[PDB]
C-alpha cells in the first residue's frame with residue numbers, strides 16, 4: 017500500500033537525539049552528541065569539537081551571518097548538514113606554509129579573489145591549503161568541518177555529550 | 180549443470196555409520212548405534228533393543244527366513260528398512276488380555292487366518308492387538324519394531340553403542 | 343484471551359502487539375521484542391525470516407515440550423496449561439548481567455497472540471514451514487496474507503494413517519523435488535477371504551516423500567504413550583530445542599548434523615552426525631539444533647507419559663537414558 | 667600466492683580449498699570449515715550467504731584492523747603483512763575445551779585464497795556486497811560467476827572525489843531504490859576568471875545515494891591522516907568487529923542500532939541507537955555489530971596514523987577517547 021521512500025535528515029529546527037542504553041559501564045565513554053543539538057546551543061561560527069582523534073578534529077559550526085576569514089597550512093573540508101551556505105575564496109599572496117589547525121586569516125587578507133561556492137545541505141567542498149575562506153549564511157545552518165585541532169577549536173565535552 | 184536427485188538410503192550390505200565427536204562429556208550418554216550394523220551382527224529375528232524410553236522400546240530385527248509366532252496385549256508396528264518381508268496374520272480366538280511386550284504365540288496358535296501383507300523397503304504395517312503375526316524373508320533385510328519391553332526384548336547396549 | 347493489537351503502521355503496514363510487558367513489532371527486515379529488566383527497557387532484533395519460521399513451529403507444536411528457543415535470546419517454556427515467554431533467561435551471559443526477563447501466561451492467550459502475529463507478519467510470498475529455496479522473502483512492507491500456509495489442518499493420528507476414522511494418507515500431494523527419486527509403490531495388502539479391510543499398511547517413504555512442511559514431527563503410529571513422529575528436514579531447524587525429557591532419533595535418509603549443548607552454558611557438549619540408519623538419544627540436560635543440507639527423513643520417537651518432566655526435575659530420573 | 671584448490675565436486679560443482687590446516691568447502695546451503703585440534707578434525711557450518719558476505723568484506727578491506735569475525739567461531743586478525751585465521755580461539759567455551767585452532771599466514775597468500783574462494787562460490791545469481799532485498803540467492807549448486815560484483819575496480823581517492831587526477835563522481839550510476847528521494851542537486855561553483863577548476867565541491871548525498879555497495883566505507887576526503895569514509899548501510903553488518911583502536915561514527919541519515927559487548931565473551935556493555943546527526947565514539951576495548959532497517963547514510967571517520975597500535979598498547983591512548 018505504501019511505497020513511499022522517506023530518507024530522514026535532521027536540521028536545526030527538527031532533530032531527535034539518539035539514545036545510549038547502558039548495560040554495564042558509562043555513557044561518557046562514547047562521547048555521544050548530536051551535531052544539531054550542538055549548533056542549536058552555540059555562538060555563530062564557534063568551532064565546536066565533536067570528534068577528537070589523536071589531534072585531528074571534527075568541528076561543528078553553527079552557520080549564521082558572516083564568518084571570520086579563516087586559513088590553514090593544510091587542506092580542510094566542510095559538509096553543509098543543514099542550511100544554505102556561501103563560501104568565499106581568496107588565494108593568499110603569502111600563505112602560512114607551516115603549522116596545523118584552522119587559524120584566523122586577518123581582517124583584510126591579501127590575495128586574489130578565486131570566487132565562491134554555493135552549498136546547500138548534503139554538499140561538501142574543499143578548503144584548499146594556503147587560501148583564506150569565508151562563510152556567509154542567510155538562513156541558520158550547520159557546518160561539519162574536518163581538520164586538525166588549533167586556536168579556534170573549542171572543547172566543551174561535559175556540555176555536549178551524554179554523561 | 181547437474182539436477183541429480185539422489186536420496187540416500189542404507190542397506191545391510193552397504194551402510195556408513197555416523198559419528199559422535201564429543202567436546203565435553205561421554206559418547207555413552209547418546210546410546211549411539213546403527214540399525215544396519217545391529218542387524219548384520221545378530222541372529223535372525225533377535226529382537227534387539229536400539230531404543231528404550233521407560234519400558235517402551237524400539238527393536239531391530241534381522242529379517243531371515245521364517246519367524247516364530249508373535250502376539251501381544253496391545254498394538255505394535257513394524258517398518259521395513261531393507262528388503263522384502265511377508266507378514267502373515269492370524270486372529271486368536273482366545274488372546275492375552277493382560278501383560279505387555281511381545282510374546283510367543285507357540286508352534287500352533289488357534290485362530291482364523293487374516294491373510295497377509297507384502298512389505299517392501301519403506302513400508303509400515305499394523306500388528307493389531309489380540310492377533311498373532313509371523314514374518315518370512317526371502318533375502319536378508321531389516322525390521323523396525325515399535326513396542327514395549329517384553330521377555331523377548333534383548334538388551335546388548337555394551338555391544339551396539341559407542342563409548 | 344483478547345489479543346492486544348494496534349492499528350497497522352502508517353508505513354510498515356504491520357501491527358505491533360502487547361503481551362504482558364513484551365512489545366513485539368516488525369519492520370521491513372527485523373522482528374523486535376521489547377521487555378523490562380534493570381529498570382530500563384531492553385530490545386532485541388531478529389531477522390524477520392528467522393523469527394517467523396521459529397514462531398511458526400512453536401505455534402504449530404502447541405508450544406511443544408520444555409524450552410523452545412527462537413535464537414540465543416528469545417524463547418518459550420511450556421508448563422502445559424501455562425507458558426513462559428522469556429528474554430535472555432536461558433542465555434547464561436545475559437542472565438549473569440541481569441538483563442533478562444520471564445513472564446508467565448495462560449496458554450490460550452499467548453497462543454492467540456502468536457497466531458495473530460503469524461497471520462499479520464507472513465506476507466503472501468513467504469512460507470514459514472518451507473525451506474529457503476522453496477519460498478520467497480520475509481522482507482518488505484505488509485503484502486497480503488498466506489493463510490493457506492500458516493493455517494494448515496491435520497487430522498490427529500489416533501492409531502495409524504490409512505485407517506477409516508484416522509488421519510489420511512497423502513495420495514493427493516505432489517512429491518517434493520528433493521525426493522523425486524523415491525519409490526511411490528505401496529505395499530501389497532491381501533486381506534483374507536471374509537476379511538477385506540482388516541489389515542493396514544502404507545509406504546512411509548511415500549508419505550514423507552510428500553511432506554509439504556519442514557522440521558515438523560507429525561504422528562504416524564501410536565502404541566499407548568509411544569509415538570512415532572517422522573518429519574522431513576532441510577536447512578536449519580528453526581529453533582534450538584531445550585529438552586525436558588529424553589528424545590530419541592532415527593535417521594532414515596541422507597544426513598543431519600546436530601549441534602548439542604549444555605542446557606545453559608551452551609557448552610559444546612557434542613557435534614553428532616547421523617547417517618542413514620543411525621540411532622541416538624538426546625539427554626534431557628542438553629539443547630539441540632540440526633543441520634540438513636539435503637531434505638531428509640527423520641524419525642522422532644516421543645514418549646507422551648503425563649508425569650515425565652517432574653521425574654527429571656526432581657532428579658528421580660537420570661538425564662541420559664541408559665547406563666552401560 | 668599459490669592456491670591449493672581441488673577439482674569441481676561431482677554433484678555440488680564447487681571447489682574445496684586448503685589453507686594451512688584449514689579446509690574450506692561448501693555445498694547447497696553451508697560453507698564448512700575444517701581444522702585440527704586434540705587429534706581429531708573439527709568442523710563448523712555457516713549459511714552460505716552469511717559466509718560469503720563476510721569474506722567479501724574481509725577481502726575488500728584488506729583484512730581491516732582488529733578482529734574480523736564471520737561469526738562466534740570463525741574470524742581473522744590482521745597483524746599487517748601477516749594475518750591470523752582462527753577457529754573458536756575467541757569463543758570462550760571452545761578455547762576452554764581445547765578444541766580451538768589458529769594459524770598465521772602471509773597476507774598475499776590468504777588473500778589469494780579468499781579471493782579464489784569467492785570467485786568459485788559466488789553464483790551469477792548472488793551479490794555478496796548487496797542487501798538481501800537487492801539480490802538473488804547464494805544457495806544451490808554452482809551456477810556461473812559474478813566477477814563484476816566481487817571484483818570492483820576503484821580509483822583510490824587522493825584528496826577528494828571529483829578533482830581531475832582523483833577518483834570519479836558517480837553521475838553515471840543509478841540512484842538506489844531506497845534513496846530515491848534524496849535531492850540530486852549539485853553545489854554551484856562559480857570560479858573567478860583565471861581560476862576555473864581551482865575550487866571544488868560536490869554533493870556527498872547525491873554521491874552516497876548512488877552507492878551500489880553496502881557496509882563498505884569509501885574515502886571522500888583526506889586531511890593528512892584524517893580520512894572521511896562514508897558508507898551506506900542496509901540490514902546487518904556482515905561481521906562482528908572486535909576493536910583495535912577507537913572508531914568514530916557520524917550518522918548522516920536515518921538510523922542504525924549498534925550492539926556493544928566485551929571483546930571476548932560478549933557481556934553486553936551497551937546498545938546504541940544513532941539517529942540523524944549523532945556522533946559516537948566506539949572504544950577500542952569492545953566489539954560491535956550494526957543493524958539498519960532502511961539503507962542509511964553513515965560517516966565513518968578513520969585515522970590512518972601508522973603507529974596507532976603502539977600507542978594503545980603503551981597506554982599513551984586510553985580505551986575511550988575522552989576524559990570528561
Ligand SMILES: [Fe+3]
Pocket residue numbers: 907908909913948954
Ligand atoms: Fe569497529
